[PDB]
Amino acid sequence: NSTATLCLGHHAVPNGTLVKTITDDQIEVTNATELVQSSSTGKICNNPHRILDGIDCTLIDALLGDPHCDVFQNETWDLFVERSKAFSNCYPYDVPDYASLRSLVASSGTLEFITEGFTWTGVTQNGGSNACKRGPGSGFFSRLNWLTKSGSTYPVLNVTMPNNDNFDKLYIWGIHHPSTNQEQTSLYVQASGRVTVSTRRSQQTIIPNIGSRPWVRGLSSRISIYWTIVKPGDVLVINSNGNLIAPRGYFKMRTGKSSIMRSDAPIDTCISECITPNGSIPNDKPFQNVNKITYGACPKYVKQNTLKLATGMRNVPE
Amino acid sequence: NSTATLCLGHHAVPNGTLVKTITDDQIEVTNATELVQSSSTGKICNNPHRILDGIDCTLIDALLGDPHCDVFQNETWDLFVERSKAFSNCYPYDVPDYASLRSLVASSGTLEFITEGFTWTGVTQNGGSNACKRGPGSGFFSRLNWLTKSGSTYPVLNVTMPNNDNFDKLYIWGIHHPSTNQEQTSLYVQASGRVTVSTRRSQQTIIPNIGSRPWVRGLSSRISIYWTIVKPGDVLVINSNGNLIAPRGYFKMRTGKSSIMRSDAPIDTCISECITPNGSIPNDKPFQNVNKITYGACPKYVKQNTLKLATGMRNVPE
Amino acid sequence: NSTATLCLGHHAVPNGTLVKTITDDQIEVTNATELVQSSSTGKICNNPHRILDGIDCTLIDALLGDPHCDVFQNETWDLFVERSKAFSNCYPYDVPDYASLRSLVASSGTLEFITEGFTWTGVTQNGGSNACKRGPGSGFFSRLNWLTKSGSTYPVLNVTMPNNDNFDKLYIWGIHHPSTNQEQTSLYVQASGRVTVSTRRSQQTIIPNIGSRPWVRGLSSRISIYWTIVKPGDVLVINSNGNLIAPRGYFKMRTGKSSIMRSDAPIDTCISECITPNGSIPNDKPFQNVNKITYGACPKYVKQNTLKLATGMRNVPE
Amino acid sequence: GLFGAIAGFIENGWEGMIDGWYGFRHQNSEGTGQAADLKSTQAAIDQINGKLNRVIEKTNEKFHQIEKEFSEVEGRIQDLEKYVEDTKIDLWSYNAELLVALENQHTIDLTDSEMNKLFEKTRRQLRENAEEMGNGCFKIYHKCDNACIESIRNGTYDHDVYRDEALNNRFQ
Amino acid sequence: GLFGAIAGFIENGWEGMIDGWYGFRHQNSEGTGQAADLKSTQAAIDQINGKLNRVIEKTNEKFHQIEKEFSEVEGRIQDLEKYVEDTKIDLWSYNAELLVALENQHTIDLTDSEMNKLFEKTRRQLRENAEEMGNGCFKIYHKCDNACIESIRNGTYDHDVYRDEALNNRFQ
Amino acid sequence: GLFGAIAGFIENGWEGMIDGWYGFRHQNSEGTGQAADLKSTQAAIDQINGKLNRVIEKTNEKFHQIEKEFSEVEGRIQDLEKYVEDTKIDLWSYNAELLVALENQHTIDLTDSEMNKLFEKTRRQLRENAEEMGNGCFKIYHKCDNACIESIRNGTYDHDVYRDEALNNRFQ
Numbered sequence A, B, C: 001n002s003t004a005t006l007c008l009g010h011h012a013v014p015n016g017t018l019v020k021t022i023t024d025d026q027i028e029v030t031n032a033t034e035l036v037q038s039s040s041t042g043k044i045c046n047n048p049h050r051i052l053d054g055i056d057c058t059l060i061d062a063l064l065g066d067p068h069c070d071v072f073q074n075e076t077w078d079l080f081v082e083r084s085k086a087f088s089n090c091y092p093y094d095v096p097d098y099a100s101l102r103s104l105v106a107s108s109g110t111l112e113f114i115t116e117g118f119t120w121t122g123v124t125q126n127g128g129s130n131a132c133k134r135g136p137g138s139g140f141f142s143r144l145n146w147l148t149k150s151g152s153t154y155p156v157l158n159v160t161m162p163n164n165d166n167f168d169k170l171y172i173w174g175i176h177h178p179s180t181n182q183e184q185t186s187l188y189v190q191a192s193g194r195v196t197v198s199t200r201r202s203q204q205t206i207i208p209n210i211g212s213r214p215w216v217r218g219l220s221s222r223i224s225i226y227w228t229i230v231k232p233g234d235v236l237v238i239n240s241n242g243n244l245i246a247p248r249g250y251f252k253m254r255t256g257k258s259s260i261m262r263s264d265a266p267i268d269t270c271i272s273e274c275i276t277p278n279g280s281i282p283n284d285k286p287f288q289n290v291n292k293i294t295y296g297a298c299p300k301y302v303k304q305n306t307l308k309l310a311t312g313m314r315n316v317p318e
Numbered sequence D, E, F: 001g002l003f004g005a006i007a008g009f010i011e012n013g014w015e016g017m018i019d020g021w022y023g024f025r026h027q028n029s030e031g032t033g034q035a036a037d038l039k040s041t042q043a044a045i046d047q048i049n050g051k052l053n054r055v056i057e058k059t060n061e062k063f064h065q066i067e068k069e070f071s072e073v074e075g076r077i078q079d080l081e082k083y084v085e086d087t088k089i090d091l092w093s094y095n096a097e098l099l100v101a102l103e104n105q106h107t108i109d110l111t112d113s114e115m116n117k118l119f120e121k122t123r124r125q126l127r128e129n130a131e132e133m134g135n136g137c138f139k140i141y142h143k144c145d146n147a148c149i150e151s152i153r154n155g156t157y158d159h160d161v162y163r164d165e166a167l168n169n170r171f172q
C-alpha cells in the first residue's frame, strides 16, 4: 500500500460506577470515590483527648459527693461519658434548672474543690441520714453540711466570705423540705425557715415547703440544690434561720474544650480525633451519616447515605 | 447551475421570555417555566389530613371543659384551626407557661379523658359560680373539681394515684387566688393555703395570693392552672390544706403528626397536601412566596416573587 | 517575498494576581478585585442615623431616673451607645429578667414619660435616702415614688387606672426588700408586705424577703424592679399593704428601627450606613471580616480574610 | 454562547421551522426545500427534561414547628425565634437565586453546543467536495438532485463518487 | 482552559499590547505592524462587568438582633444563642467560598473562548488562500500590502480576487 | 459531553489501553502498533487530583454544643432547639448534594475536552498531508515506517519532506 492510518481513542474498563450529574441521574464512569462515612468501629478510643468513664455516676452525683462516687474527687476530663445504668444511692434530692447546672459543670472540666473555713456558731454540724450509708454507719454528701439545732435553739446564721483571688468561684448549697410540721420544730425550732444567699449584684431567697411525698429509699422529705458564682473582688453573704444545707468550700471554674456525652460503647486504645456515641469514626471524608452528636474534628452530618464523586472519564465499553 | 447549497440553522419565535444568567441579567429565550408559587385558592381543603375547626373555642378552653366548648369532648385531629373570634365565657383564669401547654397539647392530637376515682374525705365537692353558667344554673369547668370546706372544717387532703399502665398520663390541676381575706376564711377556714403535687422525680408547690383584681365577668378572684406528667411505673401524690382545684382524671398522651394554626379561611372539600393560613396551595413547584407558616408536604419559602428557568435556546429573531 | 503572515494573540502584564478556582488553588491572572472588607476607620459617624451617646449612663439607669442621668429625659434615638465606664450612683437595686427589659426598651426608641395622677390616701409620699443624693440633700429616683407609713398606720392601698387611648402603656414599679425585721415595722407597720399588680389578662404578686446583704454605697437593703404593659381598652389595678415603690406615670411604646450597642469608639461627622463596635465601615463590598455585631445596611460576616475575584484573563508572560 | 454558533456566525433563527429545533434548508437545481433533524433535537430535549426533573423533585415535609407570628412583647426568647426564622429565609432565598442563575447559563451553552456539533459532523461528512462560506452554508461543487441531499441528511453520502468532478470544479 | 487557545497553541502573551485584550500582528513585504480588536475586547469586558455587578449588588439590611457577646454564665438559652450564631456564620462562609471558586473558573473559560472564536472567524474569512501553521499564525499565499491586512481586520476580504494565484502558489 | 469527542465521533473506548488515559493506535505497512500519551494523561490527572484535594480538605472542629436528644416533654425551649438542629441539617444536606452534582458535570466535561485538544493538535501537526476520516482516524497520503509515527507522537514531524508526494497522491 501507499498510505497509512493513525487513529486516536481513550481507555475503558469492563465495569464502571454510576454517578449523578446535573442532567442525568445515572451515568457510567470508569472510577469514583465515596464521600460519606457510614460506619463506626464500635469502640471509643482514648487519644489524643482525655476520656473519663462515669461507670455508675452521673455528673451531678460525682459533683455533690455521693458515697459510691468517691473516686471522682479532684478529677479532670476532656469528655465525660455517662452510661445508662447510672443510679443514685443517697438522700433524695432535685435540682431546679438541672440542664443549666449540668452544662455549666461539664463545660468547665474540673471537680477540683478547695475547702474554706466557715464558722456556724450556735448550731450542730455534720448531720447524717440512714438513706445515705457511708460504710457501716449513716452519713451524707461529702461536699455539703447539714446544720440542725443545738440543744434547744437555732439562732439566725449570718456569714460572709470574700473573693480576693483572680478566678471565679462556684458555690453549691441547698435547702431541706421536710415531710410534716413536727419534723420541722424538732430540727429547726422555728415553724418556718428561709435561706438568702447574696452578692453585690444578685440575690436568691428560698422558703421550704412542708408536705408528704412518695417514698424514695425510705424517706418522704427532699433537698433542693442551688448554686452561686462569685467573681473576683465580690463577696458572698449567707443569711438563714432554718433549713440550710451549707457549703464546705468552692469549685474552681475554667474555660476550654470540654463536654459530656451519653453512650454505652466500650473504651479502647486507638488514636482518633472524632467521637460519636456509636464510637470513633475516621475523618478523612467530608461528610458523615453515623450520628448528629459529635465531639472533635468531625465531618458534617447529612441525610444521604451515599454520594459518589467521579474521578475518571465516561465508560463506553466495546 | 453546476453546484448546490446546504445551510443549517435553528428555530425562533416571535416573543420570548427574559431570564437571568451568571453574567447577563436579562437574556431572551424561546421558552421558560415558573418556579415560585405565588397564589392560593383561599380555602382550606379537608383531605387527606383531618382538620378540626375550632369555631369559637381555643385549645385550652376546649381542654379545660368550657361550657360552650362541650362538643370538643374526646375529639381527635391532625390540624387544629383557631379562629380570631374565639372568646372564653367561664371563670376567669390564667396559665403560667401558656405556650408550653398549648404546644404540648396540640402536638399530641387527642382530648381523650379517662375518669379516675379520687376520694376527698372531709370536704364538699362540685363547687359552682354564676360566672360560668351551664344552662339555667351555676356551674364550673367540666374537667375540674372545686373543693370547699365541709360545715366548719377543712382537713389536710393527702391522696395518691399510681400508674400501672404503659403510657404517659397528663393531669391538669389548679389553685384559687381569692379577692379578700374574708373570702378565704369563709371557703377554707385556714388563713393561708398551699398545694403540693409530687412524683418520684419532681415536685411543685404553690401558695395563693390574696388581692383585688380587675372585674372580669363579675369577679375579682382568679384561678391558676398547672399540669403534671406521670410516666409508667411512677405514682402521683397530692397534698393540700386549702385552695385546691382538683382533677377528675387524666388525658392520654400520643406522638405523631399534629399541630395548631391560626387562620380564618373557610373549609372546603378538595384534595391537597400543603396548608397555609391563606389556604391550601399546590406543591408541584419547588419554591413558594405565600406564607412562612406551613403544614404538610409544602414547598420552601423564599423572598423572591418570580424565578424563571429557561427550557429552550436563545431567541434571535429575524 | 511572495507571501505574508498574520498572527493572533492576547495581552499580558509583568505581575499578575493569584486566585483560586475549582481545580487549582493558585492561578495567575492579569487582574483581580477584593471582596472582603477588613478594616474600619475607628470612628462612629452620625449620619444618616440618630446616635445617642450614653456617656456614663446605662439604659436602665437613664430609664429609672438616676440623678446623674437627668439629661436623658424625653430623649429619642436610633442607636444607643453604651460605654464600658458606666456606673450607677443611686439606691442599690436589681432587675429580674434584665435582658428582657433592656431589649424591650431599646427596641422602642423613646424615653418619653407622661405623668398620671395617682391618689395614695393614708400614706406619706416622696421618700428619700442618703445613698442617692440629688444635689445637697437626699433624694430618690425621678420616676419612682417611695411610700411609707403616715404617722402610725399604713392602710391597704387599692388603686385603678384605665387606658382610653390607642397606644400601649409601659409602667415601671418595684418592691423594697429591707435589711432587718425592725426596719420593716418602722416603715410599714405590718410585719409582712405584698404587692399585686393586675390587668384583665395578667397578674403579678411579689412578697419581700428580709435579710442582710453586702454593703453597697452604705446600705444592706435592696429594691426589685418589675414592669407591666397595658394595651388599649384594658385597665390597671394595684393592690398593696406594704413595701410598694409606686409609679408616677407611663412611658410610650413605639415600633421601628432602634437598637443598642456596646462600644468605645468616638463619634464623628461623616456619612455612613453601616455601624460596628469598631466604627463605621463602607458597604461597597459584599462580605466583611471586622465584627459580627452590626447595625444598618451592612455586608455579611465571613471567617475568611481575603477572597479575590478574577477580572481578567490568565497571565502567561513572555 | 461559548462556541459561537447561535448568535455567532449563524445570524438569526428561522420562524418557518416547526418540526424540530435544528434543521437544514437546501437550494438546488430544481427548487428549494426544508427539513428537520430529530437526532440533535431529541438530544437537547432529553438533557433539558432531565435537568427540569432534577430541580422540581420534591423533598420538603414538615408538620410541627415553632411560632412565627406573635401578638405581644415578651423578650429574649421571641427575639431569638424571629432571628432563627429570618436567618433561615435569608439563607434559602440565596440558594433559590443561585440555582436558577447557574442553570440558565448551562442551558444556553448546551443548546449552543448542539448546533456546532451538527455543523462539524456535516462538514466531516462532505469530506473534500464542499467549502464553507462562513455564514452557515456549505457550497457543494458537484451536481446534486433531491436524492443527493437526503443522503447527506441520513448519513449515506459516498464522497468517492463525486470526488473527481468536485476536485476539477473547485481547483480549476 | 477548555478550548486550548490561551496557554494552549498560543504560547505566551504580548506585553506590548495596551489597546485591547486581543489583537493582530502582521509581517508583510514592507514591514511589521500591530493592532487591536475592539469587538472581542468589548464582548469580554461586558460579560465580566455584568458578572461583577451581579455579585456586588446589595441585599442585607438588619436593625435589631440577638445578643452575641455575654459576660456571665447562665445556661441553656445562652448556649442555644451561641449555637444559632455559629451555625449561621459557618453556613455563610461556605457560600462565600463556593461562589468565588465557581466564578473564577467560568471567567477563565470565557476569556479562553473569545480567543478561539476570533481565531475561527479569521480562518473562515481567508477561505482557501491561507494555511494555519499551528502556533496561531496564518500563512497567506499571495502578496498583500498594508491595504490587504486592514481588510482582513475590518471584514472586507474578497477572496475571489486572489484565489487563483494562491491556488497556484500553494499547490505547485 | 460539550465538545462531542467522547461518546461523540469516538465510538467506544479501548480496553487494551493500560498505560495512560489517551493514546494512539497505528496501522502501517509493516504491522499494527499501540502507545500512550503522557502529556494529556498527566494534565487530566493533575486537574482531577487538585479538585479532590480541594473538596476533602478538613474544616470542622466543635467541642461543646447544645442538647440534641431529650427524654421528657418540656415546651418552648426544647421545640426551639429541635427546630435549630433540623434547620442546620436540612441546609447542609442541600450543599452536599449540589457540590457533587456540579463537580461530576465539570469532571466529565474536562475529560472530554482533553481528547478534543489532543485530536486538534495532531491535526495541526500533519499540516496538509493527511485527511480526517470522521471517526477519529487520520489517513496519511505518503509512506511511513515505524520511524515516521514516533515523530508524530513526540512532536518532530517535518511536513516539508513528504508534502509533494502527499499532494500528488491525494489530488490526482
Ligand SMILES: *[C@@H]1O[C@H](CO)[C@@H](O[C@@H]2O[C@H](CO)[C@@H](O[C@@H]3O[C@H](CO[C@H]4O[C@H](CO)[C@@H](O)[C@H](O)[C@@H]4O)[C@@H](O)[C@H](O[C@H]4O[C@H](CO)[C@@H](O)[C@H](O)[C@@H]4O)[C@@H]3O)[C@H](O)[C@H]2NC(C)=O)[C@H](O)[C@H]1NC(C)=O
Residues within 6 Å of the ligand: A212, A213, A214, A215, B158, B159, B160, B235, B237
Ligand atoms: C400521704 O399519702 C401517702 C400516699 O399513700 C402516704 O404514703 C405511703 O406511705 C406509706 C407509709 O408507710 C408507705 O409505706 C411503706 O411502703 C413501703 C414500700 O414497700 C413498697 O414496696 C414493696 C416492694 O419493694 C411492695 O411490696 C409494697 O407493697 C410497697 O409498694 C413498705 O416497704 C413499708 O413497709 C415498711 O415499713 C413499715 C413500718 O412503717 C412496716 O410495718 C412494713 O412491714 C414495711 O417493713 C411501708 O409499708 C408507702 O410506700 C407510701 N406510698 C407512696 C406511694 O409514697 C403518706 O404516709 C401519707 N401521709 C400521711 C402523713 O399520712
Ligand SMILES: *[C@@H]1O[C@H](CO)[C@@H](O[C@@H]2O[C@H](CO)[C@@H](O[C@@H]3O[C@H](CO[C@H]4O[C@H](CO)[C@@H](O)[C@H](O)[C@@H]4O)[C@@H](O)[C@H](O[C@H]4O[C@H](CO)[C@@H](O)[C@H](O)[C@@H]4O)[C@@H]3O)[C@H](O)[C@H]2NC(C)=O)[C@H](O)[C@H]1NC(C)=O
Residues within 6 Å of the ligand: B212, B213, B214, B215, C158, C159, C160, C235, C237
Ligand atoms: C379596689 O379597686 C377596684 C378598682 O376601682 C375596685 O373595683 C371596681 O369595683 C367595682 C365594685 O362594684 C366595680 O363595679 C361594678 O362595675 C360594673 C361594670 O359595669 C361596667 O361596665 C358597664 C358597661 O358594661 C359600664 O356602663 C359601667 O360604667 C362599668 O364600667 C357595673 O356593671 C356594676 O354595676 C353593678 O353591680 C352593682 C352592685 O354591686 C349595682 O349597684 C350596679 O347598678 C350594677 O348593676 C358595678 O358598678 C368596677 O367595675 C370595678 N372596676 C374595675 C376596673 O375592676 C374594687 O372594688 C376595690 N376593692 C375594694 C375591696 O374596695
Ligand SMILES: *[C@@H]1O[C@H](CO)[C@@H](O[C@@H]2O[C@H](CO)[C@@H](O[C@@H]3O[C@H](CO[C@H]4O[C@H](CO)[C@@H](O)[C@H](O)[C@@H]4O)[C@@H](O)[C@H](O[C@H]4O[C@H](CO)[C@@H](O)[C@H](O)[C@@H]4O)[C@@H]3O)[C@H](O)[C@H]2NC(C)=O)[C@H](O)[C@H]1NC(C)=O
Residues within 6 Å of the ligand: A158, A159, A160, A235, A237, C212, C213, C214, C215
Ligand atoms: C451580717 O453579716 C454581714 C457580713 O459581715 C455584716 O456586714 C458588714 O456589715 C458591716 C456593718 O457596719 C459593714 O461595715 C462598714 O463597712 C464599711 C466598708 O468600708 C469598707 O470599705 C473601706 C474602703 O472603702 C475599707 O477600708 C473597709 O475595711 C471596708 O472594707 C466601712 O466604711 C464602715 O465604716 C463605717 O461606719 C461605721 C459606723 O457603722 C463607722 O464606725 C466606721 O468608722 C465607718 O465610718 C463600716 O465599718 C461591712 O462593710 C459589711 N460587709 C459586707 C461584706 O457587707 C452585717 O452587719 C451582718 N448583719 C447583722 C444584722 O449583724
Ligand SMILES: *[C@@H]1O[C@H](CO)[C@@H](O[C@@H]2O[C@H](CO)[C@@H](O)[C@H](O)[C@H]2NC(C)=O)[C@H](O)[C@H]1NC(C)=O
Residues within 6 Å of the ligand: A038, A039, A040, A277, A278, A289, A290, A291
Ligand atoms: C448510631 O447510634 C444511633 C443511636 O442508637 C443509631 O440510631 C438509631 O437507629 C435505630 C435503628 O435504625 C433506630 O431504632 C433508632 O431510633 C435510631 N436512633 C436515633 C435516630 O436517634 C444509629 O443507627 C447508629 N448508626 C450506626 C451506623 O450504627
Ligand SMILES: *[C@@H]1O[C@H](CO)[C@@H](O[C@@H]2O[C@H](CO)[C@@H](O)[C@H](O)[C@H]2NC(C)=O)[C@H](O)[C@H]1NC(C)=O
Residues within 6 Å of the ligand: B038, B039, B040, B277, B278, B289, B290, B291
Ligand atoms: C397570606 O396571608 C398573609 C397574612 O395576612 C399576608 O401577609 C400580609 O400582607 C399584607 C398586605 O401585603 C400586610 O399588610 C401584612 O402585614 C402581611 N402580613 C404578614 C407579612 O405577616 C400575605 O400577603 C398573604 N399572601 C397572599 C398571596 O395572599
Ligand SMILES: *[C@@H]1O[C@H](CO)[C@@H](O[C@@H]2O[C@H](CO)[C@@H](O)[C@H](O)[C@H]2NC(C)=O)[C@H](O)[C@H]1NC(C)=O
Residues within 6 Å of the ligand: C038, C039, C040, C277, C278, C289, C290, C291
Ligand atoms: C473589632 O473589634 C473586636 C472587638 O475587640 C476585635 O476582636 C478581637 O481581637 C483581639 C485581637 O485579635 C482579641 O484579643 C479579641 O479576643 C477579639 N474579640 C472578639 C473576637 O470578640 C477585632 O479584632 C476588631 N477588628 C478589627 C479589624 O480591628
Ligand SMILES: *[C@@H]1O[C@H](CO)[C@@H](O[C@@H]2O[C@H](CO)[C@@H](O)[C@H](O)[C@H]2NC(C)=O)[C@H](O)[C@H]1NC(C)=O
Residues within 6 Å of the ligand: D146, D147, D148, D150, D151, D154, D155, D156
Ligand atoms: C437515506 O436516504 C436515501 C434517500 O436518497 C435513501 O435512498 C436511496 O434509497 C432509495 C430507496 O430504494 C433508492 O431507490 C435510491 O437509489 C437510493 N439512493 C442512493 C443515492 O442511495 C436511503 O435508503 C436512506 N437510508 C436510510 C438508512 O434511511
Ligand SMILES: *[C@@H]1O[C@H](CO)[C@@H](O[C@@H]2O[C@H](CO)[C@@H](O)[C@H](O)[C@H]2NC(C)=O)[C@H](O)[C@H]1NC(C)=O
Residues within 6 Å of the ligand: E146, E147, E148, E150, E151, E154, E155, E156
Ligand atoms: C476597511 O478597511 C479598508 C482598508 O483597506 C478600507 O478601505 C479601502 O478603503 C479606502 C478608502 O477610500 C479605499 O481608498 C481603498 O481602495 C479600499 N481598499 C479596498 C481593498 O477595499 C475600508 O473602507 C474599511 N471598511 C470599513 C467598513 O471600515
Ligand SMILES: *[C@@H]1O[C@H](CO)[C@@H](O[C@@H]2O[C@H](CO)[C@@H](O)[C@H](O)[C@H]2NC(C)=O)[C@H](O)[C@H]1NC(C)=O
Residues within 6 Å of the ligand: F146, F147, F148, F150, F151, F154, F155, F156
Ligand atoms: C522523537 O522520536 C524519534 C523517533 O523516530 C526520535 O528519532 C529519530 O532519532 C533517532 C535517534 O538517533 C535517529 O537515528 C533517527 O534518524 C531519527 N529519525 C528522524 C525521522 O528524525 C527523536 O529523537 C525523538 N525526539 C525527541 C525529542 O524525543
Ligand SMILES: *[C@@H]1O[C@H](CO)[C@@H](O)[C@H](O)[C@H]1NC(C)=O
Residues within 6 Å of the ligand: A013, A014, A015
Ligand atoms: C469487575 O471489575 C473487576 C476489576 O476490574 C474484575 O476483576 C471483575 O471481573 C469485573 N466483573 C464483572 C462482572 O465485570
Ligand SMILES: *[C@@H]1O[C@H](CO)[C@@H](O)[C@H](O)[C@H]1NC(C)=O
Residues within 6 Å of the ligand: A031, A032, A033, A311
Ligand atoms: C479509582 O480511584 C481510586 C482513588 O480515587 C484508586 O485507589 C483506584 O486505584 C482507582 N481505580 C483504578 C482501577 O485505578
Ligand SMILES: *[C@@H]1O[C@H](CO)[C@@H](O)[C@H](O)[C@H]1NC(C)=O
Residues within 6 Å of the ligand: A073, A074, A112, A113, A114, A115
Ligand atoms: C483535692 O484538691 C484539694 C486542693 O487541690 C486538696 O486540698 C485535697 O486534699 C484534694 N483531695 C484529694 C482526695 O485528692
Ligand SMILES: *[C@@H]1O[C@H](CO)[C@@H](O)[C@H](O)[C@H]1NC(C)=O
Residues within 6 Å of the ligand: B013, B014, B015
Ligand atoms: C406572542 O406569542 C403568541 C404565541 O406565540 C402569539 O399568538 C402572539 O401574537 C405574540 N404577540 C406578539 C406581540 O408578538
Ligand SMILES: *[C@@H]1O[C@H](CO)[C@@H](O)[C@H](O)[C@H]1NC(C)=O
Residues within 6 Å of the ligand: B031, B032, B033, B311
Ligand atoms: C414551553 O414549555 C412548557 C413546559 O415547560 C410547555 O408546556 C409549552 O408548550 C412550551 N412552549 C411552547 C411554545 O412549546
Ligand SMILES: *[C@@H]1O[C@H](CO)[C@@H](O)[C@H](O)[C@H]1NC(C)=O
Residues within 6 Å of the ligand: B073, B074, B112, B113, B114, B115
Ligand atoms: C370519652 O371517652 C371516655 C373513655 O374513652 C368515655 O368513658 C367517655 O364516656 C367518653 N365521653 C364522651 C362524651 O364520648
Ligand SMILES: *[C@@H]1O[C@H](CO)[C@@H](O)[C@H](O)[C@H]1NC(C)=O
Residues within 6 Å of the ligand: C013, C014, C015
Ligand atoms: C508590578 O506592576 C507594576 C504595575 O504594572 C509595575 O509598576 C511594577 O514595576 C511591577 N513590579 C514587578 C516587580 O514586576
